[PDB]
């Protein structure tokens, strides 16, 4: 759920990276021509899982970058507002509320109804509702 450091050379598209405190899905990794020593620089493009903003960074392939650790959990939608959604872990009674535009996957943005169970991802203290259980 927190973060960790990982060598740039080990990063892979589809995995994640933290750029400006924003957890982002890596969408492109370009490694330049290696120098006389074999060393190379990589340019990584990543998309914020929350703000959807595309960010790019350049690092020596031997360098380390911060990556977010994601936990997948289940909870139930207990309230829907014009601009937000609140879910609850029925057993622990914890509640999580987020804006629909940044805290819910585009795919299900308008498929949420109260009473349904969803799979949400959690990292860096924030959550993102990713899918509906039973799928629908």
Swiss-Prot record:
Any one GO BP annotation for this protein: positive regulation of translational elongation
Primary location class: cytoplasm
Pfam families: eIF-5a, IF5A-like_N
Subcellular location: Cytoplasm
Keywords: Cytoplasm, Hypusine, Initiation factor, Protein biosynthesis
One CC-aspect GO term: cytoplasm
Positions of post-translational Hypusine modification: 36
GO MF assignments: ribosome binding; RNA binding; translation elongation factor activity; translation initiation factor activity
NCBIfam families per UniProt: eIF_5A, PRK03999.1
PANTHER family: TRANSLATION INITIATION FACTOR 5A FAMILY MEMBER
Family: Belongs to the eIF-5A family.
Function recorded in the entry: Functions by promoting the formation of the first peptide bond.
Protein name: Translation initiation factor 5A
Source organism of the structure: Pyrococcus horikoshii (strain ATCC 700860 / DSM 12428 / JCM 9974 / NBRC 100139 / OT-3)
